[PDB]
Design a protein around this ligand. Structure first.
Ligand SMILES: CCN1c2ccc(C(=O)c3cnn(C)c3O)cc2N(CC)S1(=O)=O
Ligand SMILES: CCN1c2ccc(C(=O)c3cnn(C)c3O)cc2N(CC)S1(=O)=O
Ligand SMILES: [Fe+3]
Ligand SMILES: [Fe+3]
Lengths: 372, 370
């Protein structure tokens, strides 16, 4: 008697595969990469610093399944090229970090051909940031402006990056809390309209249909595995407006990290919150989890709803699947970028965006807190 | 029969008590403090950020015993409410862009910071921040030490105003045995003008000395505040100056009540967010220990040094156990020394056992064989 109809034109102007990596720009990459590695359970797998010959910048790669986190900091220009990332600029990293703080600089996706994806993007309105550059006849990398100071990096292959030496573990069994891949990367913009027209104008990404102080929209690729949601603030206190003021303009709001077992990951992450890891936002009242069995009782057992209450995980669902989700506190000094830990249940063939993004938890949390 | 004669003029131009804190300037203080907290075992105990009203800078205080590490990072100027009145946005950005993560202030406890500041400037010291009384309770002033590092004078009348305490709220709060700062060392291009300048406005006397650098130690009257300086003679000091872009603090020696407990805990966390250590001496170094420190350390404590890579040195009066970490940040500049002094129990004489100058030959000797 109820039905939600999804439509997918599959209008991608170029062939995109998966998310490749996320590049944070830092002031000191070593302390941030080691903070994230311990708090998130990501292995130190590659690097491109002075120990490898790179006298321009220091970059460290953390991996966990298919998720790649790159942490890049600039060296002093008096060390002069030996840079392994050709898009890197000292005056651009300093300006980015001095104005936005710790945050995401590049959102990298894998494509069939970064050189073609760059020409089609620029030809369809995108502002170019870094032209296509072929590294060692193996990898091609191009960058276009996404929003604010974030660039959409195109990555393509011929068969991590050239100039990176792989880092091998000294621990008996390396770090791993269950995070396997990036699900979606969300940015905040002043006006949602021009952002959607711009991004979808050069990517061909269609809008993913949805089942507080913001207006949200999700741009998705043909297979809906690369998800780029965007939020604008609703005025008349909004976190999006608080984001833009402390970030000095638009920027990436949060990254959702998919876990093969969100209880395993939250058990590890919450263990380390006060000993170097990441803190989490306040948990819903106990009335929230008592209301779970009546709306997700056919998906989660009685012992699994108990497990969400102990860890602070929110549950949401739509017409196709179910979503387990929780949010960390801001990763750095500024109340800007944070991290979401999710696990999607259902839509097995696993469809992209299964269970939605948790928009129903706005009222579900508001309704549950109203038991006071 | 040998004897080492030490002289102490006690020429302090003002009353100096003890080391108060060390302040790191960062780009993101949150990730630097949390990384140091896990690898060193220091407790998050105070803060001054926007959650407390400070819209100028974010400052976090890690403590372990009497050791105080402050981590400060600047906010966006588009946001005074600053708790550190000497803080400057245009100075912190320039500092971190030229030296990277490093020590900005070496703070010492004094009887009167305003008197210590006036006597310093009148004796050649370059002023950095004038005496400023905070909430009619604390006075802080800053003079140039070397490079962009400043010597900070702190005095009381009975951490700092504007700082709210944060309760650990853990059953095993972080503690690896570190208790206080022993000494803080800086590298300079020319040691001569540095000693003349620093000792010229402090009255600190040279601490008598029982590879690639020339060093001297400036100590206070009680020799509990030790400020050594290094110049280059291939030299790590020269490589430091190139990457640090001038003079600056080289390392901080953290005094531990049990260096074995601390080294276990720190080596446990090297690959999971903590700190890495410099290569350990060959096994011939530790086979030669019993004929060097056999009357101080037991055989099983020498075993404990070999398992942890700890270096042991000795002088006329005391014995010193020490070890060194790798650089704390991107640049091969500032590192950390972990020490434990044995002997000179009087309630312990500062600089007991020296600073490990004898380990340069002892380490080179141990590599000769094997
Ligand atoms: C429970 C209420 N909250 C909620 C719900 C969903 C999403 C979300 O992930 C989302 C919403 N739209 N799109 C596209 C998305 O990815 C974020 C957040 N919060 C912010 C941390 S929250 O805790 O306030
Ligand atoms: C080869 C033994 N090494 C050693 C010995 C003593 C000190 C030291 O703490 C010291 C010496 N003089 N002053 C004033 C200090 O504070 C540092 C270091 N190394 C660190 C690069 S080391 O491994 O080369
Ligand atoms: Fe999300
Ligand atoms: Fe030392």
């Amino acid at each position: 008697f109820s039905k939600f109809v999804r439509k997918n034109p599959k209008s991608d102007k170029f062939k995109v595969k998966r998310f490749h990596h996320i590049e944070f720009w830092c002031g000191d990459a070593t302390n941030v990469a080691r903070r994230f590695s311990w708090g998130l359970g990501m292995r130190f797998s590659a690097k491109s610093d002075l120990s490898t010959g790179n006298m321009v910048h220091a970059s460290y790669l953390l991996t966990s399944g298919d998720l790649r986190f790159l942490f890049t900091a600039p060296y002093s220009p008096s060390l002069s090229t030996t840079a392994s990332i050709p898009s890197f600029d000292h005056g651009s990293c300093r300006s980015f970090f001095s104005s936005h703080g710790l945050g995401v600089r590049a959102v990298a996706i894998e494509v069939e051909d970064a050189e073609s994806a760059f020409s089609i993007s620029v030809a369809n309105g995108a502002i170019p940031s870094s032209p296509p550059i072929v590294l060692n006849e193996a990898v091609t990398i191009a960058e276009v402006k996404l929003y604010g100071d974030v660039v959409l990096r195109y990555v393509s292959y011929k068969a991590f990056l050239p100039g990176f030496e792989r880092v091998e573990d000294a621990s008996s069994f390396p770090l791993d809390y269950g995070i396997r891949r990036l699900d979606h990367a969300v940015g905040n913009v002043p006006e949602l309209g021009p952002a959607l027209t711009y991004v979808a104008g050069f990517t061909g990404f269609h809008q993913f249909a949805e089942f507080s102080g913001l207006n949200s929209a999700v741009l998705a690729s043909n297979d809906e595995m690369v998800l780029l949601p965007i939020n604008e603030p609703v005025h008349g206190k909004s976190q999006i407006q608080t984001y833009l003021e402390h970030n000095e303009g638009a920027g990436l709001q949060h990254l959702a990290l998919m876990s093969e077992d969100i209880f395993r990951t939250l058990r590890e992450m919450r263990k380390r919150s006060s000993i170097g890891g990441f803190d989490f936002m306040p948990s819903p009242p106990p009335t929230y989890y008592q209301n779970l069995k009546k709306r997700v009782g056919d998906v989660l057992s009685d012992d699994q709803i108990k497990e969400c209450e102990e860890l602070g995980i929110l549950v949401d669902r739509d017409d196709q699947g179910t979503l387990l989700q929780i949010f960390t506190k801001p990763l750095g000094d500024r109340p800007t970028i944070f991290i979401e830990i999710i696990q999607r249940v259902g839509c097995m063939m696993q469809s992209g965006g299964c269970g939605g993004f948790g928009k129903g938890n706005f009222s579900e949390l508001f309704k549950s807190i109203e038991e006071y």
